[PDB]
Amino acid sequence: GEVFNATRFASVYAWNRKRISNCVADYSVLYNSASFSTFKCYGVSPTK
């Protein structure tokens, strides 16, 4: 949620790369709390 709620994102030419592990994630709440309309996914079902 915090990286979705970050004040300022990583630069274009100087994008910052990040990795998280050892927690629980859900996609339902991801578009529940933070609504979006512009999203298309390759090779993976939204439920998957």
Binding site: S28, Y31, S37, S45, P46, T47
Partner: protein, 97 residues
């Protein structure tokens, strides 16, 4: 066998449809052509399309030279059953007295 030189377009041949999203899986030797709207999200999805609704409308991006492993291959699967019913389609081998 290869069909890039006969099927692929420079701009992308988006005419061969393939579907990824359905509530039920495909039984062996069965086809489904109902292009019904699929709602990936928990929210209700009515009308023609909607957000968080992944309809089964996506086609191959077939290009002649760009396709290496993405190249189209035209595949024919021959399946047959033996010694269950009287034979009609038989071998070239000739009958004998």
């Amino acid at each position: 066998w290869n069909s890039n030189n006969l099927d692929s377009k420079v701009g992308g041949n988006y005419n061969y449809l393939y579907r990824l999203f359905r509530k039920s899986n495909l039984k062996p030797f069965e086809r489904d052509i109902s292009t019904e709207i699929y709602q990936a999200g928990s929210t209700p999805c009515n009308g023609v399309e909607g957000f968080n609704c992944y309809f089964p409308l996506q086609s191959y991006g077939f290009q002649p030279t760009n396709g290496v492993g993405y190249q189209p291959y035209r595949v024919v699967v021959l399946s047959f059953e033996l010694l269950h019913a009287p034979a009609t389609v038989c071998g070239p081998k000739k009958s004998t007295n």
